Amino acid sequence: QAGERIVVNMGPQHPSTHGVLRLILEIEGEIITEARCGIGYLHTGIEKNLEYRNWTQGVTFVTRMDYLSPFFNETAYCLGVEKLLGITDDIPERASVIRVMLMELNRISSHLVALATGGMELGAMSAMFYGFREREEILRVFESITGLRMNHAYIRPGGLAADLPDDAITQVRRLVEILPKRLKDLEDLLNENYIWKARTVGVGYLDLTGCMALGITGPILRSTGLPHDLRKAQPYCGYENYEFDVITDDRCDSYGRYIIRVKEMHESVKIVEQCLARLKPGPVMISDKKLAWPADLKLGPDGLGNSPEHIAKIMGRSMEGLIHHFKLVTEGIRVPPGQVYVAVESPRGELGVHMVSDGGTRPYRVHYRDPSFTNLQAVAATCEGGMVADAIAAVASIDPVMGGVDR
Amino acid sequence: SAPLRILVYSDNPRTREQVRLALGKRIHPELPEIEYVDVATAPMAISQMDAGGFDLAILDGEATPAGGMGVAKQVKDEIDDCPPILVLTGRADDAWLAKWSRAEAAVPHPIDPIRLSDAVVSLLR
Amino acid sequence: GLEERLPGGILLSTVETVAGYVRKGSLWPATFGLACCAIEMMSTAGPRFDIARFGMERFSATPRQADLMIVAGRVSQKMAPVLRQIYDQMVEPKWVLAMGVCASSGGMFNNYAVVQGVDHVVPVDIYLPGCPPRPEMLLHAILKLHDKIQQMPLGVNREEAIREAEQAALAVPPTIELKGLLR
Amino acid sequence: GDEPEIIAVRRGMFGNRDTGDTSGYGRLVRPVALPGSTPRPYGGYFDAVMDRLAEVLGEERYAMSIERVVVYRDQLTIEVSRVQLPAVASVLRDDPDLRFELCLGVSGVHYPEDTGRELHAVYPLMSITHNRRIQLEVAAPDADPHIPSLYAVYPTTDWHERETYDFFGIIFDGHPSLTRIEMPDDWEGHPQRKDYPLGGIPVEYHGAQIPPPDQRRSYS
Amino acid sequence: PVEMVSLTIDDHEISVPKGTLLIRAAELMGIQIPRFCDHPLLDPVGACRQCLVEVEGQRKPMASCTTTVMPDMVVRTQFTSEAADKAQRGVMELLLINHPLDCPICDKGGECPLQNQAMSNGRPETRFEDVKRTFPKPISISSQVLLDRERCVLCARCTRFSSQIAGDPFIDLMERGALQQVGIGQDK
Amino acid sequence: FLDALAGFAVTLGSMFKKPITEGYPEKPGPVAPRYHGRHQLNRYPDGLEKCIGCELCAWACPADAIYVEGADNTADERYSPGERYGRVYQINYLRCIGCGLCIEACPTRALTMTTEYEMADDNRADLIWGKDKLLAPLQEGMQAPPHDMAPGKTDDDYYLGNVTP
Numbered sequence A: 001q002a003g004e005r006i007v008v009n010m011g012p013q014h015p016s017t018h019g020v021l022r023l024i025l026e027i028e029g030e031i032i033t034e035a036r037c038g039i040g041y042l043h044t045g046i047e048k049n050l051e052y053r054n055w056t057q058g059v060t061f062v063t064r065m066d067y068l069s070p071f072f073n074e075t076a077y078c079l080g081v082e083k084l085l086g087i088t089d090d091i092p093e094r095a096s097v098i099r100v101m102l103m104e105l106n107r108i109s110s111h112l113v114a115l116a117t118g119g120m121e122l123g124a125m126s127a128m129f130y131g132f133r134e135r136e137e138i139l140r141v142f143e144s145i146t147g148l149r150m151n152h153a154y155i156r157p158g159g160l161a162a163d164l165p166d167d168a169i170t171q172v173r174r175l176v177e178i179l180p181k182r183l184k185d186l187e188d189l190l191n192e193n194y195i196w197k198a199r200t201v202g203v204g205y206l207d208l209t210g211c212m213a214l215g216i217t218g219p220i221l222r223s224t225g226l227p228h229d230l231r232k233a234q235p236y237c238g239y240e241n242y243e244f245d246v247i248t249d250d251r252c253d254s255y256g257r258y259i260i261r262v263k264e265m266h267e268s269v270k271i272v273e274q275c276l277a278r279l280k281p282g283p284v285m286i287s288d289k290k291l292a293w294p295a296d297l298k299l300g301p302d303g304l305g306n307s308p309e310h311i312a313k314i315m316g317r318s319m320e321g322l323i324h325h326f327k328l329v330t331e332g333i334r335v336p337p338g339q340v341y342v343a344v345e346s347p348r349g350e351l352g353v354h355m356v357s358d359g360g361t362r363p364y365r366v367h368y369r370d371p372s373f374t375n376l377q378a379v380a381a382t383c384e385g386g387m388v389a390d391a392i393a394a395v396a397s398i399d400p401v402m403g404g405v406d407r
Numbered sequence B: 001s002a003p004l005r006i007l008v009y010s011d012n013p014r015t016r017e018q019v020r021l022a023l024g025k026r027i028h029p030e031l032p033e034i035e036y037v038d039v040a041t042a043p044m045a046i047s048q049m050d051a052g053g054f055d056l057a058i059l060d061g062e063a064t065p066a067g068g069m070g071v072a073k074q075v076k077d078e079i080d081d082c083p084p085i086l087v088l089t090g091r092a093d094d095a096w097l098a099k100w101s102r103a104e105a106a107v108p109h110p111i112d113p114i115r116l117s118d119a120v121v122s123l124l125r
Numbered sequence C: 001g002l003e004e005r006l007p008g009g010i011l012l013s014t015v016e017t018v019a020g021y022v023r024k025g026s027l028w029p030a031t032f033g034l035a036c037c038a039i040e041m042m043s044t045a046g047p048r049f050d051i052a053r054f055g056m057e058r059f060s061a062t063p064r065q066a067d068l069m070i071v072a073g074r075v076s077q078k079m080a081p082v083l084r085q086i087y088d089q090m091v092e093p094k095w096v097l098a099m100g101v102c103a104s105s106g107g108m109f110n111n112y113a114v115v116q117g118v119d120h121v122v123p124v125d126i127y128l129p130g131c132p133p134r135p136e137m138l139l140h141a142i143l144k145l146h147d148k149i150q151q152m153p154l155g156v157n158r159e160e161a162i163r164e165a166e167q168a169a170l171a172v173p174p175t176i177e178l179k180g181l182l183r
Numbered sequence D: 001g002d003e004p005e006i007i008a009v010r011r012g013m014f015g016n017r018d019t020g021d022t023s024g025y026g027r028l029v030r031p032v033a034l035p036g037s038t039p040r041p042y043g044g045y046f047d048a049v050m051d052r053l054a055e056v057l058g059e060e061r062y063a064m065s066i067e068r069v070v071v072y073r074d075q076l077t078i079e080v081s082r083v084q085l086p087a088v089a090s091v092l093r094d095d096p097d098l099r100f101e102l103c104l105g106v107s108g109v110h111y112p113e114d115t116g117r118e119l120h121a122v123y124p125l126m127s128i129t130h131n132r133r134i135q136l137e138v139a140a141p142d143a144d145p146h147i148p149s150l151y152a153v154y155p156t157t158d159w160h161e162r163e164t165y166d167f168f169g170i171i172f173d174g175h176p177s178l179t180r181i182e183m184p185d186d187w188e189g190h191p192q193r194k195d196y197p198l199g200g201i202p203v204e205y206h207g208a209q210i211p212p213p214d215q216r217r218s219y220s
Numbered sequence E: 001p002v003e004m005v006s007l008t009i010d011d012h013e014i015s016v017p018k019g020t021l022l023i024r025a026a027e028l029m030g031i032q033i034p035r036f037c038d039h040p041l042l043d044p045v046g047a048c049r050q051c052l053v054e055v056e057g058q059r060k061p062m063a064s065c066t067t068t069v070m071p072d073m074v075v076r077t078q079f080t081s082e083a084a085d086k087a088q089r090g091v092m093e094l095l096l097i098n099h100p101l102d103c104p105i106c107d108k109g110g111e112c113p114l115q116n117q118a119m120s121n122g123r124p125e126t127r128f129e130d131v132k133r134t135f136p137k138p139i140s141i142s143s144q145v146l147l148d149r150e151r152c153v154l155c156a157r158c159t160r161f162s163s164q165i166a167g168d169p170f171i172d173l174m175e176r177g178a179l180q181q182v183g184i185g186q187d188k
Numbered sequence F: 001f002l003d004a005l006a007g008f009a010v011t012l013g014s015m016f017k018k019p020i021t022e023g024y025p026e027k028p029g030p031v032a033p034r035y036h037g038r039h040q041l042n043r044y045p046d047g048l049e050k051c052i053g054c055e056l057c058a059w060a061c062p063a064d065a066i067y068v069e070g071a072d073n074t075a076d077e078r079y080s081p082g083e084r085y086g087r088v089y090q091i092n093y094l095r096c097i098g099c100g101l102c103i104e105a106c107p108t109r110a111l112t113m114t115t116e117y118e119m120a121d122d123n124r125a126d127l128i129w130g131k132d133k134l135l136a137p138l139q140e141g142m143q144a145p146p147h148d149m150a151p152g153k154t155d156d157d158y159y160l161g162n163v164t165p
């Protein structure tokens, strides 16, 4: 009865709740009798603030929700903008290849963070450090390519912010060579560990029926054996040209999801090797000057800035070039009025983007169906009936990123 | 008969000047005289209110190193029988936090002299 | 605290310097990451860097054992009460590091949902730019906070320093009045 | 209706809401119309999906429920009439040939200039079995923002109906508990409505400050 | 009773008062015809030639800013006529060859009809490898108004206003040919 | 199965490997050459400021982290080629998100992003970096900004790169 039940806030400020997730748990003893989620402690109004910035500025906003999958947010946004523009077929092959490579490295990075934080929440102290070592290799690559460790705005409507640096390809090859070896260390700590399996196996069970009813996606859905992946079904960014296997498991529990993530990292490494093979020199931005981002970043003794060649072209020789630079930089492209829904396979499931343009230079309405937001609806199913310790494992298996949840 | 002592907390001297201008030596001739204690740092405001002897505290929600709402919450959680707190909010959407601060009244920026005076009268009455 | 009742002189000066040296080390952060900056704190703890080298490895899960509250993220409106509760439930001495532009000033999210700076709800000791600040920037800010702590006074010196800081702060004009060279 | 859905009327060249920085360019009147009904031969599997939907639904019911069909950018959007939303949702989910088991959420959008249809709710539905995608669009007036909650058909719509109510005030009647999820329950207003101000503060600078972007000029 | 004439712009029919200019009819219909010298409140001059459209039965493109509607006219703008689009883009190019590379420093930048109409109806890159016309800039025509003749497109809107609207023709189009330039008399 | 103990090998082995930590602050690690560090206002080889005060950098900033005001380059006091220069230039680094759109926007390469990143302060105002802090240091051959353009040269020459100390 009531006398034997506590109700406790797993609360925002809690190591396993990513600081801004409030699991309100009614527990009889230490069994989670009931679960509720206070959400929105990390709400930011990004969706509304987008409406007051032009396109190619909303990239900097969207990349900051689901911040563990920055490139996925950016790619979804840019795919939507291009679809409204009707230029999805005009994206240079090099730009699409780089987008795929970056999304796959980003999947590896996001899975590394998920495994690290899950292991730490479950006491696997060294798991966090090894995962973040691998992630730091990946982030060195990302920093070299984009100049930022996180919240990159590198993927832009119509292509990329800038082409890869000369050394980026060699760094990505070095990743493709060393990353599986390093991931072997993290897998050894956890994969076959008796304590890890006991702590995750059979925990947070959620059948395929539950995943469908709650609209779950990503590793949670594919832990039920359903090989659903937006990269195969409804391909985008040319994923159809890559030979990779959709990782799926039949356990339906936390360990199945963990194994799915581990295997997805290897699949992403394979896809990145394929991207490296396919990568060819060429433009990374649409040729249409009316839409192409006019900037041409280059390095010098002074630092990173518009290349002197572009400066000469726009300030010394081309009046049309100057007008195009001025306008596309300042107010940006104006997207034809329309309403589009574009989905990508972010590490946590279908990251959907409903985007509406009223013909203006700013997005009329941008909404992210972030997979974490829907996945968190599975906490009640995956925690109720288990112990609080099992609840920690189940929530870690859901691997929510509250930035994408609240937005 | 006692001069009501009012604590005005704001990193911005102009906000303190505006507060001390909307309010005068007397809010109304029916009210007692008013004495103002300007404080620019949250530690100093906390120390002053620890000494007590204040009838009202006006805390600028826009204070740079330590916003007024935080100071209001702190004083109501730390000083027993603390004076009523009036908070100056930098925007309309801060109203919610103004409630959370438990400040007896909130006055948006820019400080309307008459609105501030009326709120102060309501709190002192 | 009896350390505050100690009279000035060499005794109080030595107590102050010892306390500053002790507290700059073992400055345990609170396990209170928000938004994407939290990932950068974790990276700072990661092997490539080592927060542990500064004695700060123990991220006190409970606010009771935490010394430094690295907000490290964007504070939404609904979260400000929680953040203030955590800050209060820490025990003196307390320091707050506003890691990232969002924590320090609301950053790019100048809208209803964000608080527009942690300092709106808790005293901020160091502001750290970046979005997110790379781990070296976090370590730089932490070392600046260490320098601030080392010089932190106590007792009668604390009271005198508070009075002097008040006298100084009462005079500084607001940023809006620094019209240098504006047309 | 049959004409394209005008959501806003912009007057003057250069996408300027105000009077105009240069005289003489403010006389252009261009209505911003979202695409209208598509001609019947829908591309791809959309034609099959609509044929099946019209077969399962009676001709009378199909006419009463489906307000419009828009095939834009090779994406199918069924402007479904309010009230009938639960019926068509059940038909889409349960029918073996349609079988849209996975509803991906509910997105609110606001059209303050769209008379009688200011609030729109978008239901992205996916059928994994057939590997198909569609969207349902349900319009409600700002004065009567009620919409039938799909909670019985698609439980996932919970936390999406709640979120869209929080950010737009769309009352999904029949929802088990339509409480705010993002904003505090004590919050006033629905932030993502266009009339709701951005709520920013001026950015400070030595000797100056930059008002929030919503107050400053724009040329959308 | 005002007489309504009817005509098709592109392929859409519309009825407008007799005497209406094609540019005004297009505005009412929502077609954005590029224009510089046209002004609704100034008497049309047809100078810049930017508003050219194809009209059935006319060998030459017609300046929509000077063409009165006719009861059965068929008009197709750059949106539905390659000839009209080519004419308008050629006019824009010729308009930009002599223009200064001043957008970063130009006060009109961001609110410049020339920038917007070059984006919407202009080529993406220059072909003008030759030398640009140049004038001393900025010269003052009064205590308040600065004049940068290099940026002038000689649309005569300033002069046409100072003559028609305000009866103060103290500025006028001086010189001839490429040297033509708005100006005050000598110092008046 | 010794496989279940594989983790013990990983940690033990890593005990005998050299730690991979970078030695910041004494031996700071290498940031990427393209890293988005502090903005910097650059000068021409003769010392004139590149910033023409067009405010495009401020225009493109999504966080409104740049405030710029232009002024005329009067012959008595010229700071940049052409007729405009950036008289007041402030970056609110508590609003900057390092996105780099400003440098992409700048049409003169006046604004670059150096690899320097160390920045922090206990005061909100001190992180509003003005023109004085952002201007690149005056190198050899550069003169004070308030000086006339290089002899026999004009703005176009500066932009085309035909200027030397």
Ligand SMILES: CC(C)=CCC/C(C)=C\CC/C(C)=C/CC/C(C)=C\CC/C(C)=C/CC/C(C)=C/CC/C(C)=C/CC/C(C)=C/CC/C(C)=C\CC1=C(C)C(=O)c2ccccc2C1=O
Pocket: A014, A015, A016, A017, A018, A019, A020, A117, A125, A128, A400, A401, A402, C030, C031, C032, C033, C034, C035, C038, C039, C041, C042, C045, C057, C058, C059
């Ligand atoms: C008493 C007396 C005077 C006696 C006289 C003698 C004398 C002086 C001494 C006697 C001996 C004594 C008493 C000594 C004193 C010291 C003592 C007793 C012990 C204390 C020291 C101690 C226990 C040291 C060892 C403990 C230890 C090994 C600590 C290390 C712990 C580690 C590894 C912490 C790192 C964890 C970490 C990476 C934290 C980051 C997490 C944070 C903050 C982010 C939050 C967060 C998380 C966590 C997500 O999951 C997440 C996921 C996705 C997106 C966002 C987030 C997010 O925001």
Ligand code: SF4
Pocket: A064, A067, A151, C034, C035, C036, C037, C072, C073, C074, C099, C100, C101, C102, C103, C107, C130, C131, C132, C133, F097
């Ligand atoms: S400062 Fe940047 S990285 Fe940090 S929480 Fe804010 S948006 Fe995220």
Ligand code: SF4
Pocket: A323, E099, E100, E101, E102, E103, E104, E106, E107, E108, E109, E110, E112, E113, E114, E115, E151
């Ligand atoms: S008038 Fe010329 S220089 Fe000025 S903004 Fe327009 S196109 Fe650019």
Ligand code: SF4
Pocket: E151, E152, E153, E154, E155, E156, E157, E158, E159, E182
């Ligand atoms: S100065 Fe006169 S003629 Fe020249 S562009 Fe301006 S209005 Fe037209």
Ligand code: SF4
Pocket: E104, F050, F051, F052, F053, F054, F055, F056, F057, F058, F068, F086, F105, F106, F107, F108, F109, F110, F111
């Ligand atoms: S830094 Fe560049 S973009 Fe900014 S005002 Fe100066 S020249 Fe213009």
Ligand code: SF4
Pocket: F039, F057, F060, F061, F062, F063, F064, F065, F066, F091, F095, F096, F097, F098, F099, F100, F101, F102, F103
């Ligand atoms: S880095 Fe981005 S946000 Fe920061 S000043 Fe430059 S453009 Fe603005």
Ligand code: FES
Pocket: E034, E035, E036, E037, E038, E045, E046, E047, E048, E049, E050, E051, E052, E063, E064, E065, E066
């Ligand atoms: S606008 Fe008609 S010719 Fe100039």
